[PDB]
Design a protein around this nucleic acid. Structure first.
Lengths: 58, 852
RNA sequence: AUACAGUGAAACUGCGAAGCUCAUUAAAUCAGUUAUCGUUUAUUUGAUAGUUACAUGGUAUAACUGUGGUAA
RNA sequence: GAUGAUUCAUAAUAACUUUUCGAAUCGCAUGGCCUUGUGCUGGCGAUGGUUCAUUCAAAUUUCUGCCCUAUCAACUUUCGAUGGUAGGAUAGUGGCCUACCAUGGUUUCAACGGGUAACGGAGAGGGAGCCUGAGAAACGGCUACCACAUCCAAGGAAGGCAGCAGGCAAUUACCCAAUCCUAAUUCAGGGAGGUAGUAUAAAUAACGAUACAGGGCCCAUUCGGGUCUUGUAAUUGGAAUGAGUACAAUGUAAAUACCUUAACGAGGAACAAUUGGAGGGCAAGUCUGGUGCCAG
């Protein structure tokens, strides 16, 4: 049944409507702002023990 | 009625429209309940998608059973008890009931390789291993969806620490699990990976953060429909080309048809492709084409007939396209051998003229003299000498997999091409047949597993010249840093696996796990002299095996599962039963990799030499924070070495490697009689003792091995050339030279001992042939004993021979070869070989007279 | 209730489990009767056995506890 | 001793037995004694046990018992047919079976065979074998086959539905109370069983008052003749009650139903039964034919 809700899923237009300490982590995870790739940009590695931090490969 | 965030549907529709895949990482105990809703969204997007679902699990299913009768009984009991209503099913139960779900254990992933599924589900994240990620992801259909259920509680903390900071890694109370901690961060990089909770809310760790719905709707299909339409009238090409799924796959068939039309029996056609690109479909169609063309004796060879089930299946489909009809036009013969599991061995075809397709084992190349066409499927898995024998005066079709199954290193394919440079025709299949080209997930899977990594020639070395060996310096690679994705690390990681894959014969996908999680393994790199990412020249993988690993093993038995094994201590223990060797701490060089272009320049030998110095002490916390990154490489002086008693190597015995280890002062201790099926090559363990530590036991092992090798040379090592056998003998004899002690020494033959082994009647025969009063066949009984004493050194200093003559005497005595056989191997005339031998025993006859 | 003692899941014992649809058969079905000194017989009823012991063993296990295989 | 009748009952002797049985069990009460030791001695039951009789049955078994029949005259020994002896099986007798022996047995007094309004005994997918029990060759179970057919990860597992009930479509819901049946039993159960579900007599009306009109009807092919309280397509008044709307009790395992029984319930009593037939008549209406104004 396309228009009718089958199981718990109902589809209208382009939007879909469905019926529905670890909890603290999930909410903390939900509230993250920076993307990993954006956090990825900031991080530098040391190639050697006393070498400079190299961020992006040339 | 809670609206999903618009990102989840848009990604699904975008993937279906673009025929691109998508990953979903569901975190939560109710993760299973979302899967029915996700699947409804796929079928709603497009009804043409495959409805079969792949379920993968380790041992147990999450709260349900795959048996239909067990559930309905449980349902019926629940209804009878009144716990559940008569007709009330939850969506999750309805999902499993109606759809086609295939339940597969992680161990048995070989079964799912062929089948096509619309959707793949991975139950357990902790048990994820690289082959299971390469294998299962490839079995989805384009526009399909992969779901990983991150339900384990400990993983959720691992997720949390990554999101709060990329630097610190959560670590529980010896397996460190970097690959799984490495598995998470790449999912963020992927544009088509979305991580979601059990309430269908988007976690921001995902790369798919800015996904937007694409407008409603490919060039490759246009180039394919036009090609098929143009060839419809041209049978048998039209019907067979119609079976083609991609532009490149059709071209491969056409090139095969051209080879079939040319009728030249000195022609070899090479197909190189990745797994899942449709090679076996291409070969099966062409075999139907040759069979329609008029070829009578068609041959097929592969490591096992079972792998050919796909190839035969597409032959029958090409047969169906060409009007071939079963039990009228052709007959199918299945194997009677239980090992082959009723695999198709022969197909007999009868219209026009009697034509036969038959399977032949790669070893049996003699029957191929009458062959008009041989198709070698998965030539990468067949030994190089055997495929050479399979290149006879007939049409050859060869298919080799690059990064598929175990396959082979890319350079090995290149070496084969260089040998072919017989006319050579090369065909490459790059377009996949299962999904849209350039899918992010395949690129994601390749970067994670580094399957597609390629070695690159660096101009910088050429401008500055090759570094002289003494200038280079070995550096310890910190594994924590290497598997962290800092973008310099990956390019450094890729360069290592680029050298890793190319050099040695066979490398499994699960290897990328092995050096990652296992503690005993350590990485060493022969970096160029420092003066940009440093580019490796030689990489060594060590495994610490001995008393050191016992503590880890005892911990391993405590949890209830034993991990890995100490191969050398077990190998040495079973053969000789020396308790002390197991106690001795030692290291095994799992693999030494050098650039094939820069081979023979001594980079590998020096790395072993500098490695030997480091563990000898001649050069005398970097762990990550456990819930800023330490240096990628660590100098030898900076980390103390562990106390070791020996350095061990295990490798397939070949002349080049044996000389390489022979020059590095290693001593052989064991050789496997049973040749490895994939290589046809005998595994050898060869050992070196460091200075300042006892060396007697190596000498005792070497002496036993020589008596081992001499006697066993007849059983299964007759195939080895006489020269190769001598090098094994001499390398062990170097071990005696290592020991300056005279406590153990050979004994000279006594007169009483001589009388027992040979009667006086024999000594008359020994004398007469020297006088030339006998035929050689009479003294045949004497030869094997004569070889044992000489290589056993019973005659001593008095009798000595040349390397060529030792090869001759070694072989008739112990390889057991006939003299004329020796003539070919040594490139000597048969008469000269006999004349040289007659001189050998004249010395020996003179020697026995002297003692008498 | 200082063996337990009320009730009591599970398990071991004891008793009992003995409408339909096809075909068709003349005193071989069946009905009446006689005999069983030629016979078996749960159960009901009544009779009926003077020919370590202040109590033997696991030569015993279920239910039960715990460890696993299997699509089942 | 018993019967009409016995080698029947019973008793004894000599042995035999994969020699049986002759309470190592449970509930309630704590009496009588004394030799104060918890010493001796004990009341009512349950569950067990040998044999006999009795009872519930069963298996063989005597004689009798309405169709037409010869256009059904021989049948039987046809892998026992008639009988004897010995054995095997059998709760047991017994050609029930087996070894030897004799050729017998029914029949024109109707053997044997045939037909029949002789509904006037079998199986549980099909044949074979086996297991329990006092009682079965079990609508139970097991094995081998012969086919059917289900599922599966294709390595195996399991079924008797090859059923039942329907159409050419609702068999369901409530109970062991009433009569009975089985059990460690008063108490628990029984789709045994019970309860419920889905051609016949009435009503649509009965009774008065007033007003206004002269016509109503019968018979007669014919012409006409015969006879008197009639019509309303008028107004009006007070009574009765049934279907329905339903408060109850009763009823019953409960419940439906039945019987009985408070209140309400009629003028268009619209609280509005049908069916068929025979005649009319009407237009600034329509069609057709003719000798105005006609005829169809």
């Amino acid at each position: 049944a396309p228009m009718s809700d089958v199981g718990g899923v109902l589809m209208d237009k382009d939007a879909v409507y469905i019926d529905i300490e670890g909890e603290k982590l999930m909410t903390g995870l939900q509230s993250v702002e920076q993307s990993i790739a954006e956090k990825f940009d900031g991080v530098g590695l040391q190639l050697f023990s006393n070498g400079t931090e190299l961020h992006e490969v040339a | 009625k809670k609206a999903i965030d618009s990102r989840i549907p848009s990604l699904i529709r975008n993937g279906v429209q673009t025929k691109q895949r998508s990953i979903f990482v569901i975190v939560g105990d109710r993760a299973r309940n979302q899967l029915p809703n996700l699947h409804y969204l796929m079928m709603s997007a497009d009804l043409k998608m495959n409805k079969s679902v792949l379920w993968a699990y380790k041992k147990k299913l999450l709260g349900f059973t795959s048996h239909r009768k067990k559930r309905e009984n449980k349902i019926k009991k629940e209804i009878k008890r009144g716990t559940r209503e008569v007709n009330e099913m939850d969506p999750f139960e309805s999902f499993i009931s109606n759809q086609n779900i295939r339940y597969v254990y992680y161990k048995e992933s070989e079964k799912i390789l062929g089948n096509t599924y619309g959707m793949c589900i991975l139950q357990d994240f902790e048990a994820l291993t690289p082959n299971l990620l390469a294998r299962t992801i490839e079995t989805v259909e384009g526009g399909g969806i992969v779901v990983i259920l991150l339900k384990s509680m400990s993983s959720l903390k691992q997720l949390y620490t990554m999101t709060m900071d990329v630097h610190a890694r959560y670590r529980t109370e010896d397996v460190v699990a970097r690959f799984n901690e490495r598995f998470i961060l790449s999912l963020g990089s992927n544009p088509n990976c979305l991580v979601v909770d059990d309430e269908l809310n988007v976690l921001p760790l995902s790369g798919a953060k800015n996904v937007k719905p694409l407008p409603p709707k490919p060039p490759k299909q246009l180039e394919l429909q036009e090609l098929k339409e143009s060839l419809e009238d041209v049978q048998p090409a039209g019907s067979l080309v119609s079976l083609s799924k991609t532009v490149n796959q059709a071209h491969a068939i056409l090139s095969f048809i051209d080879a079939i039309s040319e009728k030249t029996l000195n022609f070899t056609v090479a197909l190189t492709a990745g797994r899942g690109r449709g090679k076996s479909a291409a070969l099966g169609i062409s075999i139907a084409a040759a069979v329609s063309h008029g070829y009578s004796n068609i041959f097929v060879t592969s490591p096992s007939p079972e792998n050919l089930k796909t190839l035969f299946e597409f032959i029958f489909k090409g047969f169906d396209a060409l009007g071939y009809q079963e039990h009228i036009d052709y007959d199918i013969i299945q194997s009677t051998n239980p090992d082959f599991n009723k695999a198709i061995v022969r197909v007999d075809i009868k219209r026009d003229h009697r034509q036969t397709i038959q399977y032949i084992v790669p070893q049996d190349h003699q029957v191929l003299g009458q062959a008009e066409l041989v198709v070698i499927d998965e030539a990468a898995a067949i030994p190089l000498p055997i495929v050479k024998n399979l290149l006879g005066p007939y049409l050859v079709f060869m298919a080799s997999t690059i990064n598929g199954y175990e396959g082979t290193g890319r350079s090995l394919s290149l070496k084969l091409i260089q040998q072919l440079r017989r006319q050579l025709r090369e065909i490459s299949l790059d377009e996949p047949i299962r999904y849209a080209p350039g899918d992010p997930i395949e690129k994601w899977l390749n970067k994670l597993l580094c399957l597609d990594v390629t070695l690159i020639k660096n101009p910088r070395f050429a401008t500055r010249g090759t570094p002289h060996p003494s200038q280079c310096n070995l550096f310890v690679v910190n594994r924590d840093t290497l598997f962290s994705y800092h973008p310099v690390s990956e390019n450094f990681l890729e360069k290592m696996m680029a050298l890793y894959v190319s050099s040695h014969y066979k490398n499994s996908p699960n290897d990328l796990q092995l050096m990652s999680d296992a503690p005993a393994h350590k990485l060493f790199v022969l970096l160029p002299p420092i003066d940009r990412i440093p580019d490796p020249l030689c990489v060594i993988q060590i495994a610490l095996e001995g008393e050191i690993s016992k503590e880890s093993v005892r911990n391993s038995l405590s949890r209830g599962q034993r991990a890995g094994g100490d191969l050398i201590p077990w190998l040495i223990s079973q053969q000789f039963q020396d308790e002390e060797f197991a106690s001795l701490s030692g290291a095994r060089i799992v693999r030494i990799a050098t650039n094939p272009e820069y081979a023979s320049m001594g980079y590998g030998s020096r790395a072993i030499e500098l490695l030997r110095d480091y563990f000898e002490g001649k050069f005398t916390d970097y762990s990550i924070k456990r819930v800023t990154l330490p240096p990628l490489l660590l100098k030898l002086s900076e980390q103390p070495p562990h106390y070791l008693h020996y350095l061990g190597v295990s490798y397939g015995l070949t002349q080049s490697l044996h000389k390489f280890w022979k020059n590095n002062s290693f001593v052989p201790v064991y050789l496997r009689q049973t040749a490895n099926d994939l290589t046809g090559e005998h595994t050898c363990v060869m050992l070196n003792v460091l200075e300042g530590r006892e060396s007697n036991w190596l000498v005792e092992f070497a002496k036993d091995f020589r008596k081992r090798f001499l006697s066993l040379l007849s059983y299964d090592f007759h195939k080895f050339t006489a020269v190769q056998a001598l090098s094994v003998i001499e390398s062990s004899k170097k071990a005696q030279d290592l020991s300056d002690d005279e406590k153990h020494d050979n004994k000279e033959l006594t007169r009483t001992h001589l009388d027992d082994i040979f009667s006086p009647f024999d000594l008359k025969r020994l004398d007469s042939y020297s006088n030339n009063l006998l035929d050689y066949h009479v003294i045949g009984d004497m030869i094997p004993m004569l070889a044992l004493l000489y290589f056993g050194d019973k005659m001593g200093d008095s009798v000595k021979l040349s390397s060529v003559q030792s090869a001759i005497l070694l072989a008739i005595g112990l390889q057991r070869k006939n003299i004329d056989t020796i003539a070919k191997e040594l490139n000597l005339p048969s008469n000269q070989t006999i004349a040289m031998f007659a001189k050998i025993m004249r010395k020996m006859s003179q020697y026995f007279r002297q003692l008498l």
